Amino acid sequence: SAYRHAVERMDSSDLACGVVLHSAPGYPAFPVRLATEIFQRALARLPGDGPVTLWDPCCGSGYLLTVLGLLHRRSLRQVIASDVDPAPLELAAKNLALLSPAGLTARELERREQSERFGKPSYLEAAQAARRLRERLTAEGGALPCAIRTADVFDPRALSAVLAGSAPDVVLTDLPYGERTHWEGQVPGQPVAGLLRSLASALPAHAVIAVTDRSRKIPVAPVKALERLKIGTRSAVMVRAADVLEAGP
């Protein structure tokens, strides 16, 4: 596949994992360029272009959702994060804190304090990145409403509490490594199918569900794929919520 939206390689350095946004040893970053490509492909499959509610129900460290929240602030009404275990969620919460000017100010201050203490140039590189992100966030809509809760995405009855009355237009998630057959591989068909059915039970009919994995092709049949892409070692697939429901059990 070719980049349709992220056509020219951007300066995504301010959003790099471990600069302003928070890194973890146990969770991967996600490439910014691919994140924005997938998100823009999903937006292109929505009926209209009003403000979008975006949900990541396997949010991990929250890096992915936070990249999208900042980068695509102008296109977003709110973001929702959820995942099954407490460990990732502590870090996801730190990342989501960056979706307000106050959170970015706090991170910038932390980096400036680290500069004074340690003297490493990178801390000041990070403080300036946080300042720039805050300035863009302020100009592009201000604080982005966000919520984060624990929930098992495979349990459809858990979902209404995560949504708290919101109707997500886009789900975008990087599949958790524990759902893979093994660490090297990919999530198999039955788990993917169950994930999609669970989500579609909670979403409005028009919602676009976009999932990505380390694989050549993510199995969704008998659901019809709206669209697929392959970039590097990663693939993505998008489906419509209404179509998932039409496929049956």
Resolution (A): 1.5
Under the phi-then-psi rule, with left for phi > 0, alpha for psi from -120 to 50, and beta for the rest, what region is 165?
left
Strand 170-174 to strand 76-83: parallel, antiparallel, or no bridges (unpaired)? unpaired
Q: Residue 135 in contact with residue 177, Cβ under 8 Å?
A: no
User: Residue 113 is part of a domain; what is its CATH number?
Assistant: 1.10.287.540
Rg (CA), the chain: 18
Q: CA angle 97-139-89, nearest 5°?
A: 15
Q: Are residues 138 and 171 in the same domain?
A: no
Taking residue 34's Cβ as centre, other Cβ atoms within 10 Å add up to 19
Give the domain extent around 116: 101-143
Q: Are residues 120 and 83 in the same domain?
A: no
Q: Token digits for 6?
A: 């992220």
Q: Are residues 135 and 87 in the same domain?
A: no
Helix locations, 19-154, DSSP H: 32-44, 63-71, 86-97, 101-118, 121-139
Q: CA angle 61-200-169, nearest 5°?
A: 65
- Report which residue type is found at 121: P
Please tell me the distance from the alpha carbon of residue 101 to that of residue 196, in angstroms, as a whole number. Answer: 34
Total number of domains in the chain: 2
Place of tokens 């980068």: 71
Q: Are residues 9 and 96 in the same domain?
A: yes
Residue (of 82, 59, 81, 63) closest to 155 by Cα position: 82
Q: Residue 95 in contact with residue 68, Cβ under 8 Å?
A: no
Q: Are residues 52 and 110 in the same domain?
A: no
Q: Are residues 93 and 208 in the same domain?
A: yes
User: Residue 240 is part of a domain; what is its CATH number?
Assistant: 3.40.50.150
Last residue of a domain, one of 143, 173, 196: 143
Q: Residue 171 in contact with residue 208, Cβ under 8 Å?
A: yes
Q: Are residues 23 and 115 in the same domain?
A: no
Please tell me the distance from the alpha carbon of residue 107 to that of residue 159, in angstroms, as a whole number. Answer: 31
Q: Are residues 76 and 135 in the same domain?
A: no
Please tell me the distance from the alpha carbon of residue 26 to that of residue 85, in angstroms, as a whole number. Answer: 13
Lay out the sheet containing 170-174: strands in order across: 146-150, 76-83, 52-56, 170-174, 208-213, 234-240, 227-231
Q: Are residues 7 and 53 in the same domain?
A: yes
